[PDB]
Write a protein that binds this ligand. Structure first.
Ligand SMILES: [Ag+]
Length: 297
């Protein structure tokens, strides 16, 4: 017999979810930078109040290079304007200067002020941080030289390493939980996600690129981060773990009959996890099973 107090569950067919944890490295994304490089070749000036580790916005100062060749060309052009000159010829000369590297705004300014144009302070393009920033004091610059570069933070990248098989299992962003030791947030969005086929033969792991959402600012490189990644399995018959009993080779449980009448069924488990058990053999889909309750022999 089995007096009332029950509770019930019904076998259903599904995959089992396996949760795994990996350690991510927080990194600055490569494409989100800005390289301030210089057209023409030039000497440096002023050099500003910057130290290589600073916040910058729209590049608003940075430094100034005064240049030789352009000035000579401008002077020749000015002389042509003063005398009398083919307007077209003057235009061609201007075009050559523009080609050399003249900023267009600067050329317009020179035309407006018939002032030999000579000194430009260049401003960095993006609101940003600077990755490399150390040259100073009037030095030669050439061709297109790095005036250096600026790092941006709208995005961030957290890297986790996965086994190849587990990685193939991946698919969808939802089975992704990201968390951090320093600065736990309301949470962190995962905005993009990618597997870089490059197999860390050091080990047999693929590299997972994760683009975190850095719009408010609480993110840095080499901070520490845990990627709790969710996974799954070919589908199996699933019972709600609690109702299942063995303590020996006896291994199983009770089947209802809509009659409210019980019975023993000998099931095989396969695996257990997270909160449910998956049987290899034993029960049929939809069969009823019990998840709470007690009764007497
Ligand atoms: Ag299975």
């Amino acid at each position: 017999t089995q007096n009332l107090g029950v509770k019930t569950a019904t076998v259903t067919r599904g995959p089992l979810t396996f949760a795994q944890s990996f350690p991510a490295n927080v990194s600055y994304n490569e494409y989100q930078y800005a390289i301030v490089q210089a057209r023409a070749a030039g000497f440096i000036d002023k050099v500003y109040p910057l130290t290589v580790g600073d916040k910058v916005q729209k590049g608003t100062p940075l430094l100034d290079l005064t240049i030789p060749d352009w000035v000579e060309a401008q002077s020749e052009y000015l002389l042509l304007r003063e005398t009398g000159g083919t307007a077209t010829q003057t235009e061609g000369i201007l075009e050559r200067l523009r080609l050399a590297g003249m900023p267009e705004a600067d050329i317009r300014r020179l035309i407006a002020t018939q002032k030999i144009q000579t000194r430009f302070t260049l401003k960095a393009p993006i609101d940003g941080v600077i990755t490399a920033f150390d040259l100073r004091a009037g030095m030669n610059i050439a061709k297109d030289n790095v005036v250096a570069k600026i790092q941006g933070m709208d995005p961030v990248w957290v890297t986790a390493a996965i086994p190849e098989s587990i990685a193939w299992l991946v698919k969808d962003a939802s089975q992704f939980t990201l968390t951090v030791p320093a600065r736990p947030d309301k949470t962190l969005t995962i905005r993009k996600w990618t597997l870089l086929p490059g197999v860390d033969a050091a080990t047999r792991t693929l590299q997972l690129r994760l683009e975190v959402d850095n719009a408010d600012e609480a993110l840095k490189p080499g901070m520490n981060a845990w990627l709790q990644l969710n996974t799954a399995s070919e589908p199996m018959l699933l019972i709600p773990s609690q109702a299942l009993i063995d303590t020996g080779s006896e291994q199983r449980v009770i089947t209802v009959d809509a009659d409210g009448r019980f019975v023993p069924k000998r099931v095989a488990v396969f695996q257990a996890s997270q909160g449910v058990t998956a049987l290899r053999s034993g029960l049929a889909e939809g069969e009823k099973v019990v998840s709470s309750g007690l009764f007497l022999i």
